[model samples]
Target chain A: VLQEKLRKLKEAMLCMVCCEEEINSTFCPCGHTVCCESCAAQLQSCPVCRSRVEHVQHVYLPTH
Target chain B: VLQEKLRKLKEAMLCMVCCEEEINSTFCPCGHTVCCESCAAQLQSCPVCRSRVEHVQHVYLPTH
Candidate 1:
């Protein structure tokens, strides 16, 4: 049971929004959002962005 | 502001519970704790363990 939970937990730490894909999002401006689900939420804003969620976008893509 | 914060954020995601070392620990029983610092704290138990932190130890070492 614990091992299964840990596996899921690790998955949770990964990209929920872009499930099965490398994480491609963070919240707009607060910048605290970690995974796709958090990034892709339809609500007003994520947890960290203080003022507004205007900046929503993916992070850390190498053009190389 | 955001980029720098994102950089730090990534590091935070890596392991605040462990700080520098590859997260060598999780809480005793809850199995939720993700790092060493949190694991190493003199606290009673971790977040996930329901009853108590019975056994605490490092996770995932490769001999290969």
Candidate 2:
């Protein structure tokens, strides 16, 4: 059970689009982070929220 | 050993400033997120990067 939680947590850290890189960018307005910097740059809108991509802020997560 | 990683992951999700609420906002330009929406509104600059708070984008993390 504990391992499962850990696995889920690790999975969550991965970019939803590529499922490889760690998420490092967040979409503005809608505030959904589901991709890495590379993927974020290509996106026209937020994948999760379908909101207009006003801005893409590259973030650093201490855990990663 | 596994539990330690899980603990660290959970800790990383917490707001760095309040150390209570989960982080839900990202500071633009500098791209740092270390506080919740409530705490983010009160700040003048980012706690992690010390950059001017040009914009505060509320973010949603899948892990949280």
Candidate 3:
């Protein structure tokens, strides 16, 4: 049951912007993890903090 | 078995540059889907065709 819950949590953590996919990208100059890679590039600034997007890092979530 | 296979295929659709996350972004002026959103911002040009990245689109993959 715990494992199942974890999976559900991860699914919920999907791209906050798209609300349909897993989050695999993070914004820089503010370090906000709100959207997936696709969403990040399209965004001119950090969606959470409105910082200039000078960098972006691909976060690798650990696998089970 | 087929359903499980589909899940694995989806997992394999990760960022080409990092090799560990789902692809959510695409490059413009070349229309290449190589890296996740994070890597896309860092790159000045498309990794595949060396085209200038004037635009990036976040793609939402259809759900199963």
Candidate 4:
């Protein structure tokens, strides 16, 4: 398990609405959402954005 | 947020207990339990075993 995961669990317990943006951050390009930092490395276009979950992660905040 | 988090949360939601060599694994030396393959670098002591909070890393770290 990732040590960070423990904290994240606690974080999730504290607030289930995180979905990145606040905790770390998430991004979407075409239609899928990739890991925040790993987004760029994963692809050039946001899968979700192109399809639905728009916003370039860092470029866009969380849903809330 | 860590992209892997989604899969992890999905895993957690699917099963409350993941005790041992399945999928991934967590180690607990003291009396606590470390989630999976993300505790070696931190140290040999288990947090929850030592005091509390078995362990965490990768994303859910320390706190939100």
Best by TM-score: 2
Off by over 4 Å in 1: A1-64, B1-9, B13-22, B37-41, B47-51, B61-64
lDDT rank order: 2, 3, 1, 4
iRMSD for each candidate structure, in the order shown:
16.9, 1.2, 10.3, 16.2
Using lDDT as the measure, name the better of candidate 1 and candidate 2.
Answer: 2
Judged by DockQ cut-offs, is candidate 4 incorrect, acceptable, medium or high?
incorrect
Candidate 1: interface RMSD in Å? 16.9
Kindly report the interface RMSD of candidate 3, rounded to 1 decimal. Answer: 10.3
User: Considering summed lDDT, which 10 consecutive residues are worst modelled in model 1 chain B?
Assistant: B55-64
Q: Candidate 3, residues A1-64: lDDT per residue as tens digits?
A: 3556446655756787878867766565455656878888889897777878886666543221
Which is better, 1 or 3, measured by lDDT? 3
Chain A TM-score, each candidate? 0.42, 0.90, 0.74, 0.25
Clashing pairs in 1: A17-A36, A17-A37, A28-A56, A30-A49, B17-B36, B17-B37, B18-B36, B30-B48, B30-B49
Alpha carbon lDDT at B26, candidate 3: 64
C-alpha local distance difference test of each model: 0.44, 0.82, 0.64, 0.34
Chain B TM-score in each of the candidates: 0.44, 0.88, 0.73, 0.27
lDDT of 2 by residue, A1-64 (tens): 6878878888988999988899888887768888999999898988886878987888776766
